[PDB]
Structure formats: structure tokens, C-alpha cells
């Protein structure tokens, strides 16, 4: 992988692995999400950020502040096949004091055609208290030099799918998968549940008949609270419609919400 | 990746990814096992085998026969760090009519030092009946041309660990993790639980204090029966031992049917 000529975006190529594909011999949406995370990490490394946390400047590290995902939105037109090379370009852009957006564009390396796109919203949070505290402009000044200044949007349109409000699923859900728990492979280097695990948990309550006859086109996921290594999760899904679904992840006991989302699927 | 000059082994380099590492910022043993599987698949592809199944000749495919893992044994001296390049060489060898062995050697790409080794035993099974049924010599003839003829062992030692018999853990287990179930990410392209998932399930019952103060040096795992996508698994571990050794058992909650047994060896950090 490498930073582009202007130093304001990063590109990397990935050869799709045998264990990374589903029944259609194409990459799963969790494999895609893992590659988006990897290219994001390599972009942070390329611009001088340390391996300590993820994209924290020395000022954020001093203040015990970290970046946390509030939303992930992924649209895939074609999933890359096993052995194919997919090229991914990523960049970030400030959205004022609220937070930062990281965008991605996925391409077929042979044809140069855009096969997918993604966007995410990130906020600054104190790692110890979990509060989105007052921070001050001197922190943001440190990041601005690594971002393009003119707007560069993977989803440029005003009021597009990536910015839509997601409602809360009401009981009874049409489908459910109960008692989901993370294992050691689901944890990151800091012993926190990796963000991709929640995508997998959302998709666990989609009926097998849908997975067998459709392809996932769009997934939008909000992140409200983390699942601790000892928490247990219930995955709920209701058809709202192409087939569209509303999703809710909540802690098995008291029903505390950890994520909400929507998926759009097209017939194969 | 590429076949070597003599066409009898295959080598591939992997850059360790951010999500592939544990707390020490080095590759987990499940990341290693996934890379061993990947280099094995690329070796099969390089010698003409189709993307249909795994290393199945046209004769095996006609007879509805597949290769299935009976044992995996991995020994790691140093786990590669995040961003490091690890080079892995793999090859296969017939062990008569019983089955075939696939071996691997892992090296640090910068120094050329051996950082790990692995071996596995594979058997032919009918995909439909799950029987290890009678198969003629014409099937084996098809594979012999892709294997070295002189013995080439990743584990040459006399009474080496890779061939030791594993006993059955007796209740009560010292530690356990109950109710483990696979999710869609744990399945392969044929909707079967990936062999690496069972390694993860075995390691779930190792106490957190061990994972925090030790590094996994050796894991030997026997595969007796598959976990179906709707089965539920219990992971049991008992200490058998500076080094810590454990005996492991995976069994279905449904009635206690054994799916795997194994042992692990850990060294203080
Ligand atoms: N492309 C798809 N990836 C996944 C991952 C998990 C479940 C369903 C699907 S469909
Ligand atoms: N919050 C931000 N983190 C990064 C990392 C790499 C490049 C740009 C930015 S802006
Ligand atoms: N190197 C190690 N890999 C793993 C994977 C799962 C649990 C424990 C360990 S120690
Ligand atoms: N059973 C065997 N499968 C393969 C795959 C690649 C090379 C050699 C062999 S022998």
C-alpha cells in the first residue's frame, strides 16, 4: 500500500483469500469490513501515527482520548471472487467539531471499475470515562494537514442513504438469533470487541432463505454501546419492504441497545 | 506465492494485518492456522486442482470423495508482529494407503530464521456417507507426481510430539466454556465449520491469567466429528503439568458426543 502523490489519500491492493469467501466463492461483507479497517490502519501508519492506538496524535494520547465509530455504511455492487485483486482507496475529512468521516472506494484491479463504496462517522471519546468531553481546536489542527480541504465524498448527494435516521425495532421481531457471545478471535489488540463482529451479529438473524437467494447490497449500522467480553447479545430483524430489513442488537438480559441498522438485499 | 524450482513445494509471503493480532501485537495462533490453510489452497491451485473442492482430482470428484483433516499440530517459536512479513513453505507426502501429510515451515522474511512449523494428517472420505471407504490405487497415482519421493519431514525427531496419542479428558474438568455456537463467519464456502474455529473453541477454556502471562508454544488437535451449523459445543480443559500443559476436550452439549481432543503447551512470557 501507499499514500497517493498529493499525500491526502491511501491505496492498497488485497488478494481475496480462500477462507474469506462465502457460498458464492466471493468475499463476505465481514471480509470487506475487515479490509476497510486494515487500509484505514495502514493509512494512519503512513502519516506518522503510532502503533499505540488508532490514529491518535500525541495530544490525544496525553488527554486519554480515542476515536470511536458512531456509524458504518457500506454499499457493494460486486463482491470480489476468491483470488481476485481488489484495490481500495481511503481518505478522511473533518466535519467540524462533531467528528471526522473516513470514506472508502473499492475497485476491480483489472478493469478499474468501482465495485463498492463506504463511509463512516467517528467521534472523540475519553478512553477511561467513555464521555464525548470538551476538547479544544488545538487537537483538530493536528489532523487537518492529513485531509483534503475541498469536500470529497464517497456519497456526495444531499440526504443520501448513508445519512438516514434509523428507527428502533419494536417487539415482537419477525426473526431473532439469541445468546450470541464473542470469543477471543472477536477481540482486537486492546481486548475490545472488533467493530466487524457487530456486523456479523446483525446478519445472524437474516433467514437462511434470504442469504441463499439474495446478495447484500447495502448495510448501515449505528454503534451506541459496546458489548463487553462477558456480555451476551440478541440479534433481532424485521422485514420492512428488493428485500429490506430493520435490525436491532441488544444485551440478552435487560435489553440495553448496543446497535441498530438496516440492510437492503437484491435477488441473485 | 509460487511453486519452487523443482515444483514439489510452494512458498507464499503474508503481511500480518491489524485485526490478525492479539494483545502482544503479534499474530494469534488462529491467524497462523488461517495462513496455513491459505498457502495449502494456493499450492493445490498452482498444481492444477480446481476451485470445486480442496485438492480433489477428477477421479475423486467422480467418486464423491474429499480430503478431511484427522490431526493438526503447530509449534511456534516466535509469532510475527503486526506489519511483519512471514514466509511459509508447504508440501505434501503420501503415508501409504492410510492418508497424506501436509507439512509447513514458517520463516521471518528479513532474517530467514525458522519461526514455526506445522504438520497435518488427512484422510479420504466419501462426502455423502462420511465413510472412509475402499478406494483403488489409481487415485493415489494421480497425487504422487506432486509430492517429493524422499522423506521430507517438518518434524523429524524420534518420538516427536506431533505423533503422540491424546487421552480423553475425564469429568470434572478444571475449566470450561459452555454453549459455544458457530456463526456465518465460521463457515467455509461449502457451509461447513472451518477447521480453525475448533482451535478457537479449544482455547476458549484456557484461563485469562494463562493467556495474559504465557505464550502458546505447541497445539495438537485431533478431529473426530464435525460440529453442524446448528450444534452447540462445550470446551473443557484440565492442567496436566516454568511450562504449563493442558488436556482439552470439545463435545456437543446435545449428549456429550466428542468432536475434538487436544493438548497445548505454554511458556511463561
Ligand atoms: N455478502 C455477505 N456477507 C455476509 C456475511 C454474513 C452473513 C450474510 C452475508 S451476505
Ligand atoms: N481523524 C483522522 N485520522 C486520520 C488518519 C489518517 C489520515 C487522516 C486522518 S484525520
Ligand atoms: N497465540 C495465541 N493465539 C490465541 C488464540 C486464541 C486464544 C489464545 C491464543 S494465544
Ligand atoms: N493429497 C494431496 N493434495 C495435494 C495438493 C497439492 C500438492 C500435493 C498434493 S498431495
Curated annotation (Swiss-Prot), chain A:
It is found in: Plastid, Chloroplast. Keywords: Chloroplast, Fatty acid biosynthesis, Fatty acid metabolism, Hydrolase, Lipid biosynthesis, Lipid metabolism, Plastid, Transit peptide. It comes from the Eukaryota. It is an enzyme of class 3 (hydrolase). The keyword Transit peptide applies. GO terms for cellular component: chloroplast. The active site is at 190, 192, 227. Its main location: plastid. GO terms for molecular function: fatty acyl-[ACP] hydrolase activity. Its EC number is 3.1.2.14. It catalyses: (9Z)-octadecenoyl-[ACP] + H2O = (9Z)-octadecenoate + holo-[ACP] + H(+). The keyword Lipid biosynthesis applies. One of its GO terms (biological process) is fatty acid biosynthetic process. Belongs to the acyl-ACP thioesterase family. Plays an essential role in chain termination during de novo fatty acid synthesis. Possesses high thioesterase activity for oleoyl-ACP versus other acyl-ACPs. Substrate preference is 18:1 > 18:0 > 16:1. This is Oleoyl-acyl carrier protein thioesterase 1, chloroplastic. It comes from Arabidopsis thaliana (Mouse-ear cress). The chain holds residues 75 to 359 of 362 of the full protein.
